[PDB]
Write a protein that binds this ligand. Sequence first.
Ligand SMILES: *[C@@H]1O[C@H](CO)[C@@H](O)[C@H](O)[C@H]1NC(C)=O
Ligand SMILES: *[C@@H]1O[C@H](CO)[C@@H](O)[C@H](O)[C@H]1NC(C)=O
Lengths: 167, 206, 219
Amino acid sequence: DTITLPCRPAPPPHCSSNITGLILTRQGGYANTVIFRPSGGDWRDIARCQIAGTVVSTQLFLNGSLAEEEVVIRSEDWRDNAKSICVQLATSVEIACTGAGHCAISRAKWANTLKQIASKLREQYGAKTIIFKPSSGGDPEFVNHSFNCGGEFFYCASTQLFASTWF
Amino acid sequence: DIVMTQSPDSLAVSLGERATINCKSSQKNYLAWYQQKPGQPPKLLIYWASTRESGVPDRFSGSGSGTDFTLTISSLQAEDVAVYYCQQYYSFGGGTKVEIKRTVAAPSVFIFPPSDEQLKSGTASVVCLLNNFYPREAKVQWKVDNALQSGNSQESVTEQDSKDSTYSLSSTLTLSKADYEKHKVYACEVTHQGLRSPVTKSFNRG
Amino acid sequence: QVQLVQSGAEVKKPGASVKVSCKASGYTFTGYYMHWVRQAPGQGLEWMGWINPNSGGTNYAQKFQGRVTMTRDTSISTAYMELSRLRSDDTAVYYCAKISGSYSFDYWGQGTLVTVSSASTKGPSVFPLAPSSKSTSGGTAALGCLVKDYFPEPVTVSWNSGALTSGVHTFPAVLQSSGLYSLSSVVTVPSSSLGTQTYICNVNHKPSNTKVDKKVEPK
Ligand SMILES: *[C@@H]1O[C@H](CO)[C@@H](O)[C@H](O)[C@H]1NC(C)=O
Ligand SMILES: *[C@@H]1O[C@H](CO)[C@@H](O)[C@H](O)[C@H]1NC(C)=O
């Protein structure tokens, strides 16, 4: 079973990539749960993570650098909800595009990735319940997972990737 | 997700004396202090805990580190009366209202029965006025035929007078005309530090 | 010079939505996050969320998630805050504020008062607070006017067309359980003046176009 993200326009098969990281925003305000969404920032947030490869992408790092042994999370200031949280994976997650308007990701591999991310965030914020929620909104490039490939620019709705609760 | 608490909620300072406002966090220090006057947005005074914004007089200084921070006004001027807020990231403290401390002043107390004009409309407002007192704390109680009233009055207090630094207060007892005509003696009793004993003003309806 | 200019005051019914704008000039609009902060009358500052003007990404206070929407139009350097499903306790002054590099708010909009109420515009009734012996103490008498049952704020009160200012106290309005406001305005004068000087309270309520001059007579 897989997670099938709608994309426009249709990414061709040679644009399938390896998700190597992602960038999150921690929701503000105040239940002992901590909520994360794909970043509400912009290109400055993405560049300062310093784990991207050559592909320009939002929300997810494609074909970037991998951590050595386990997931690593970093932030310029954990107490500032306006600073994004950089998540660098240790084993990549493949995202295969069919050329028909969708790119697919294994549900079990994505769930196991989110569990490791949740665990690292749990140790950083000393919480108990980590909740991933969809983008709060924004321009098409940032509310979607967007990325360039072969001179073309593609937009994939990512709401299915960020919708889980982890204890 | 960090709560900033300020103490006290209210500070009365004698003119030309030192005012100290505390801010404590519940969990470079990014604390900022703001001054807010009526009808205006807060105005930034201090940032980075101790750096004074341009144009802010030298009598304002901030200090602290880690968990506890302090705003000091070294010599209070009349223009410094305002509400002060601290801020760390996107959490604000609850505010400290700074006012002038003056000697005690007893209120002058006046009661006003409902006018015949109002009674003709079907409602009766009875007004108790406490004029030009200090400090602000006062106890106003309504008794109707000796029965202490509850839940049918409302109080309003002026801001501190810019000229003599006193307050005034009105308390309004609202009754329907029918309920007002059921009783005889209407009394407001005022307790205040400036009074050697509580003061009652009353009248017989009619 | 940096300026943030907000849209005008709004009166809404419960369940409606309000959209407040904040036009920025004097600086690169996309270079600094815009935050929104509100203040209920007499109360403190409550943070609502931020918007990144470059991307349009947002981060709302959890309290307002699913009720607030923050957007911006970069071509006119204007940020917007929409709050829907309004309740009476959303009555507040709403501020936009621009964060600085020192993570303080160096520039604020002037504020937008949003009043949520079921009441309709209504002018006040003005009733005399007559001086007598129950409002006399040691050569000084108190008199006034009760300005009752109006919506929305504000009314203005003056005495004898501005000739009388000494000893005047106009109290903050109180919201009654009817949804209408009420206040008193009082003045203390020499009790020897009661039989010779005329005292008129001049009351105006711009929203209802109400103008009342009420003479207050002894006894
Ligand atoms: C990621 O790398 C693979 C293999 O080199 C390549 O085929 C793919 O096009 C790259 N992804 C993007 C978005 O360019
Ligand atoms: C992802 O990486 C693996 C090796 O880590 C590689 O064999 C595979 O082709 C990559 N997938 C894509 C779509 O580039």
